[PDB]
Design a protein around this ligand. Structure first.
Ligand code: SBB
Ligand code: HG
Ligand code: ZN
Length: 258
């Protein structure tokens, strides 16, 4: 039936409706830090989120998305392995039912508690729909979340989760500054991949930050109270909305640091 993360409609079943699931540049992947090629030609990443305009938080049945006004170059990602300007359209997380899993990408087979995906699309393509039809249409900045001290910047998000507990619910969520979610360092690994949830389009230049951000146990706990189901249906806790690592195949993961 409709795709999900359960036994009967999960990642292992995706290839049936989305043949690209078994494609050449699927994400996420395991970042083998020792096979990763340090690349001194990679520029530093440039994250300009000062003019960021968040609009709302939406529980879409598979995660909760914080959407941003991407009608202008308000919050953009440039540099690094990117050619051109990528606009922030939304960010979401993938988390586990337990702290030892939840990330999509793994570093040396290590799973983090969650993974923040700041989704950007290449402005040369005009709109998000067009960019998803291009090899370099998307740039997702992935940030690992490890359980530790609270990330103050993530608290506004956590607080509004009560309002969007079920599928389909949305809440006004303005004046949220995504810079509060960035780790201290912007070093990254980059490789060409795809969306990690159907349609699994292979339009993503993945920029996975080396340094994770730490969030508190209480914070990730509130993620786990979200529901996959809509209001009125049997309750299915939104946890483990992550896709397992896919074969790297003919790809090289480059690193911006030694
Ligand atoms: C055209 C359908 C599209 C749906 N999908 C996504 O946006 C998406 C984004 C990132 C990732 S991941 N896990 O790889 O980081 C997976 C999926 C979609 C859906 C609703 C929309 N509203 C505005 C734009 C827009 C785009
Ligand atoms: Hg594509
Ligand atoms: Zn994601």
């Amino acid at each position: 039936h409709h795709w999900g993360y359960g036994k009967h409609n999960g990642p292992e079943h995706w290839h049936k409706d989305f043949p690209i699931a078994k494609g050449e540049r699927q994400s996420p992947v395991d970042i083998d830090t020792h096979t990763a090629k340090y690349d001194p030609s990679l520029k530093p990443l440039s994250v300009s989120y000062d003019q960021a305009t968040s609009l709302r938080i939406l529980n879409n049945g598979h995660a909760f998305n914080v959407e941003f006004d991407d009608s202008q170059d308000k919050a953009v990602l440039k540099g690094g392995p990117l050619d051109g300007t990528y606009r922030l359209i939304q960010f979401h997380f993938h988390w586990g039912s337990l702290d030892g899993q939840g990330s999509e990408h793994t570093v040396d087979k290590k799973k983090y508690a969650a993974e923040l995906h700041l989704v950007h699309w290449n402005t040369k393509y005009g709109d998000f729909g067009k960019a998803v039809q291009q090899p370099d249409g998307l740039a997702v900045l992935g940030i690992f979340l490890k359980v530790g001290s609270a990330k103050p910047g993530l608290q506004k998000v956590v607080d509004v989760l009560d309002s969007i507990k079920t599928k389909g619910k949305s809440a006004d969520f303005t004046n949220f500054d995504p810079r509060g979610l960035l780790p201290e360092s912007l070093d990254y690994w980059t490789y060409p991949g795809s969306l990690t949830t159907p349609p699994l389009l292979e339009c993503v230049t993945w920029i996975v930050l080396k340094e994770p951000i730490s969030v508190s146990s209480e914070q990730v706990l509130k993620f786990r109270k979200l529901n996959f189901n809509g209001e009125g249906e049997p309750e299915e806790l939104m946890v483990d909305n992550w896709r397992p690592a896919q074969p790297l195949k003919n790809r090289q993961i480059k690193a911006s640091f030694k």
